[PDB]
Amino acid sequence: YKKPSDAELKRTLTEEQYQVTQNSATEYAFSHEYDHLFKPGIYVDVVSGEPLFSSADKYDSGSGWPSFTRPIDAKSVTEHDDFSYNMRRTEVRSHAADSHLGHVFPDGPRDKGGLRYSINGASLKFIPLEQMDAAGYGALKSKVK
Ligand SMILES: CNC(=O)[C@H](CC[S@@](C)=O)NC(C)=O
Ligand SMILES: CNC(=O)[C@H](CC[S@@](C)=O)NC(C)=O
């Protein structure tokens, strides 16, 4: 409920950020750095800068995309069913900017809830633990492992 026009996004995002978040174009498995990033911090929507994921919940599923057991809060994302490409899938988008993020699957680690949020790295901006104050995310420094 807080998204710019596509033309504004076209001039402010990279081609990969644009195609993934605005056209739901899945990045190639293993292609984004965030697939192999495991440092403390938060992952935010590239469009709104709203907090989406904590480093605490990030894990390697071996899929080739950033994987998380949960969003930072259920409120941060919007999920819906998708029956395209002949599949039953649940798409995940950010709440405020409504960016396409990826999909959620019921094959995540059971000790952490059983869900795998499979997210394009291109849909995210990583904010390191240390920069979280300077960038306005002080109050979430404690969701971070
Ligand atoms: C290759 N990755 C896995 O098998 C991951 C690792 C889980 S975490 C909690 O370290 N497990 C699953 C179910 O994807
Ligand atoms: C079973 N895997 C898929 O359907 C994945 C979705 C990954 S998340 C990042 O949307 N898509 C492809 C094209 O392999």
How would you describe this structure to a colleague?
The chain is of the alpha+beta class and 145 residues long. The protein has one domain (1-145): Metal Binding Protein, Guanine Nucleotide Exchange Factor, Chain A (Beta Complex). Helices cover 11% and strands 28% of the residues. The chain is built from two helices and nine strands, in the order ααβββββββββ. A six-stranded antiparallel beta sheet has the order 3-4-8-7-6-5. The protein has a three-stranded antiparallel beta sheet with strand order 2-1-9, with no helix packed on it. It is globular, with a radius of gyration of 14 Å. This is Peptide methionine sulfoxide reductase MsrA/MsrB. Has an important function as a repair enzyme for proteins that have been inactivated by oxidation. Catalyzes the reversible oxidation-reduction of methionine sulfoxide in proteins to methionine. The active site is at residue 118. It comes from Neisseria meningitidis serogroup A / serotype 4A (strain DSM 15465 / Z2491). In the N-terminal section; belongs to the thioredoxin family. In the central section; belongs to the MsrA Met sulfoxide reductase family.
